Structure formats: structure tokens, C-alpha cells
């Protein structure tokens, strides 16, 4: 069963939101996928932000919209054809 990512951080100096998370070292290359969904005024589906990247960050500027809605994030990990469960993140409202 594949390891689940940890320490899901959301950061934004100015209006440039980027997600950062932690992962362990593996003999193979862990490739992550990041999803973001807004809620409040609207109730969108989970939309991909960064698909299969190697690094521990993901800029989500182009997924921010309507400061009234809060954003929530989740990230999973892949190694081969197996995937990890989602690391659900806490809420994000204002910069």
C-alpha cells in the first residue's frame, strides 16, 4: 500500500497561492497529483492543479477566484501503477 503525503501547507505572499507538502525518500520517483476545490458561494468538483509532478510544491494561482469562497486542497502520491490516499488539507480564505 503506497505512503500518504504529509504536512500539507498552503502559502500565499501576495495573491500567488502555492501548496507545499512533505514526503519520504523512496528508491523510486514519487510523483504527486494536486487537486483544489472552492466552496461557499459555489460548490465545484475537485479540479486538477498539478498532475504528476516530482517536486513538493504546486502553484495554484489560476484556480483562485471570488475571494468569498474558501479553497480546500488534497494531494495523493503515485509510484508505478499504485496510488496513495488523499492527504486532505484544511481551509484557506484570505491571503
Amino acid at each position, epitope marked *: 500500500s503506497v505512503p500518504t503525503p504529509t504536512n500539507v501547507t498552503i502559502e500565499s505572499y501576495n495573491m500567488n497561492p502555492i501548496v507545499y507538502w512533505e514526503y519520504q525518500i523512496m528508491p523510486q520517483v514519487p510523483v504527486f497529483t494536486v487537486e483544489v*476545490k472552492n*466552496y*461557499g*458561494v*459555489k*460548490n*465545484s*468538483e*475537485w479540479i486538477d492543479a498539478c498532475i504528476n509532478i516530482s517536486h513538493h510544491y504546486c502553484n495554484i494561482s489560476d484556480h483562485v477566484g471570488d475571494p*468569498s469562497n474558501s479553497l480546500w486542497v488534497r494531494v495523493k502520491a503515485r509510484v508505478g501503477q499504485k496510488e496513495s490516499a*488523499y492527504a*486532505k488539507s484544511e481551509e484557506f480564505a484570505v491571503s
Partner: antibody
Amino acid sequence: AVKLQESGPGILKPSQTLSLTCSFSGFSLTTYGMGVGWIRQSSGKGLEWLAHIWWDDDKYYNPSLKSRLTISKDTSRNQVFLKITSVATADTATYYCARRAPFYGNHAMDYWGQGTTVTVSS
Amino acid sequence: SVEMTQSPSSFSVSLGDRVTITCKASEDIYNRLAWYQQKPGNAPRLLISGATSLETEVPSRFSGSGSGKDYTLSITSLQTEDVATYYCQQYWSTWTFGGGTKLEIKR
């Protein structure tokens, strides 16, 4: 008083297109955060969410049916419309349209129309 | 998509009983749950929103609860006016209804 009513063709043939109308009063779809959606239900079956439209013309469709649905709104007439192409017999059901409860973080459907039953047959 | 399992489709109960209906969501829907009651040949009536908020007019014998993926509806004293089908609904990511649970009475 907030009311909603669905109008439909009654009986319609296969392969055609279905024109559904949701006429409402009591509120405005121009007001920020307002929205209306469709839900269908066949005899002794559950409820199936079809589509939803927002005050800003942002539209949401149920993936399983996206390709056959088109939802639009006309504030100057206070009606929301739904179009369903390639009409099949499975589609025989009762159609409802309902609004989004006007409270932040709430998207439960508070007011519903009585619904209109459409039978798909030749 | 998110799935909502309501088991079962029906439940044999007697008036006066306390009834709990179970609704399970495939992933955390963060308490964005609604509950609807529907008597034959009528549009569904919204009972509860936000997992625990009763709509006005709804009798106090009704209550909802749960969290994460597990939510339930409880009626403390079943009365005829309560015999209907009950549907739960997730409104966190667009909308999904549960299969429904129809109350039937024992005899």
C-alpha cells in the same frame, strides 16, 4: 411568495430532444449566489441530479449525462431551461427544478416545483 | 464523483419507535448534507441541511447528525405523518442523492 413550476411536453418520442421549462417567481436569478437545478426521478426509483445554473451563467452538469444536457437561463422571463437530446425510453420520468437555499455554505434545495412527468414512447 | 449509500431501500418500523436512517458518503463531505422526505406523488420536502440544521416548521422529533462520511437521521416517535421515503444528499461537490429509505410499518 417563492414558487417554482416545471413545464414539459407530456409525451415525446425517442431520438427527439426534450425542452423543459422552470418558471419561478418570488426571487431573482440575478441576485448574487442564486442558482437553480434539475433533478429527475422514475417510478419507484431514486432521485437523479441533472444540471444546475448559477446567477453568473456558470453551469454544472451531471457527468453521466453532460453530453446530452444544455442548461440556460433568461432573467427577463424568469425561467431556467433544460434541453435533452437523443431522448431514450429510460428517460421517462418526472422532472423537477429547485433553487439553492439562499445561505452561504448552504446548497441544499429549499423550494421545489411540483414536477412534470414526461413519457418517452412511440 | 462522490457516492452516497443509504441502506437499505426500506425499513420495517412501527409507530412510536425511534428510527435512525443511515447515510454513508464515499469521502469526507464536510457536513454539507441535506435530508429530504418524500410522500408518494409529491415533491421532496427539505428537512435538514448542514447535517444538523432543521428547516423551520419541521417537528422536533426529527434530528440529524454524524460527520466525515457518516450521517444519520433520527425520528424519536414515528407518527403516520412521518411514513415516507427519506433521502440524504451531499452538496459539497455539486449534488448527489442517496438511494432512499422507504418506511414501511410492521404488523
